[PDB]
Structure 1
Amino acid sequence: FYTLNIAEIAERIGNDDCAYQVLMAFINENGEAQMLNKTAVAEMIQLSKPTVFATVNSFYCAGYIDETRVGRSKIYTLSDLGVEIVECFKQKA
C-alpha cells in the first residue's frame, strides 16, 4: 500500500536517544540480532520502563520489531525492516 524510505527513518531514529537505544538493544555483543522481553530492554538501556515499553510497543506497530507469544508472555526480535534500519547505522559507524 505505501512505500517507505529507510534512510529517512534511520535519520529520524538517530535524532532520538530512546528510539535509537531501543533498536540497538536487539543487536548483541557479536553483532547478531537477538530476542528480548520488554523487561530486558528497559534494564539494558538507562531509561524508565514507561518510556522504553511505549517505544517497544510503537516499534512493533511500525513493524520494526516482531512480537511472538512465548509462555504467556511475549518476545521481541527485529523484523527484516528492523535489521535494514540497523544496517544504515552500522555503515555510518
Structure 2
Amino acid sequence: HFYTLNIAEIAERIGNDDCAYQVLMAFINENGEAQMLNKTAVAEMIQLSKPTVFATVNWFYCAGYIDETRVGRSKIYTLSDLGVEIVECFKQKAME
C-alpha cells in the first residue's frame, strides 16, 4: 500500500507552522547535513516550551518525518528520506 504525494504542499503547511518548522530544521547542522538528535537535545536547540517540542517530535515520528533508533538506554531520532525531502524544499525555497 503505497501512496504518491506532492510533498511541496505539506512543506508549505509545516513552513507556516512556527513551532513545526524549527523542530524539523534542528536536525540540520550548520554544514547543511542532517544529524541525529534525542528529544532532550532538540528541546534545547529551540527556545520553546519543552512539552510542545516533545509533542512535535512525537507527531513528526508518526507522520514519518523522523526515523527512531534504539541506542543503549535512550531513543535517538534522524530524518527519514521524507524528512530530508521536506528540508530539500526549504533548502530550495530559501535559495530562490
Same topology, TM > 0.5: yes
Aligned-pair distance for 1:67?
A: 0.5
Aligned-pair distance for 1:49?
A: 1.1
Deviations along 1:6-49, one digit per CA (max 9) or x if unpaired, are: 00110000100111000000000110100001011010001111
Aligned-pair distance for 1:58?
A: 0.3
**Percent of paired sites with the same residue:** 99
**5+ long unaligned stretches in structure 2:** none
**5+ long unaligned stretches in structure 1:** none
TM-score of the superposed pair, with normalisation by structure 2: 0.93
SS at match of 1:60: helix
TM-score of the superposed pair, with normalisation by structure 1: 0.96
- Look up the match of 2:16: 15
- Look up the match of 1:87: 88
In the TM superposition, structure 1's runs of 4+ consecutive aligned residues that sit over 4 Å from their partners are none
